């Protein structure tokens, strides 16, 4: 986990948290338990306009998955976006 990311995500707006919880549910719409595997995550990438390799997907998911279960949950997912905020020169 990362307190630096949760600190910024926690100070977010109600609309933000609601958005992540929504977009996340739309992605897991195919799953049965409610998660996103690198296998499917790669397919959705097409929507964004990018088509990264399959093995590369799990790469970014490795540093994200704190439990290393092999998939991204609503928890690791939400923080995933927040991490994009700290991405500055």
Three-state secondary structure of 33-56: CCCEEHHHHHHHHHHHCCCCCHHH
Nearer to Ca ion, 56 or 67 (CB): 67
From the list 4, 33, 36, the residue with the least C-alpha distance to 20 is 36
Instruction: Check the annotation: does 69 bind a ligand.
Output: yes
Nearer to Ca ion, 33 or 55 (CB): 33
Task: Report, in Å, the least distance between residue 69 CB and Ca ion.
Answer: 4
Strand partners, 36: 72
67 counts as binding Ca ion under rule CB under 5 A: yes
Query: In degrees rounded to 5, what are phi and psi of residue 36?
Result: -130, 115
65 counts as binding Ca ion under rule CB under 5 A: yes
Instruction: Check the annotation: does 53 bind a ligand.
Output: no
Binding site for Ca ion (CB under 5 A): 65, 67, 69, 73
**Residue stretches of the annotated binding site for Ca(2+):** 65, 67, 69, 71, 76
């Amino acid at each position: 986990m990362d307190d630096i990311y949760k600190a910024a995500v926690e100070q977010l707006t109600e609309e933000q948290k609601n958005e992540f919880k929504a977009a996340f549910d739309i992605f897991v719409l195919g799953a049965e338990d409610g998660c996103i595997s690198t296998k499917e995550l790669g397919k959705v990438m097409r929507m964004l306009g990018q088509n990264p390799t399959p093995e590369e997907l799990q790469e970014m998911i490795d540093e994200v998955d704190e439990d290393g279960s092999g998939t991204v949950d609503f928890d690791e997912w939400l923080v995933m976006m927040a991490r994009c905020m700290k991405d500055d020169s």
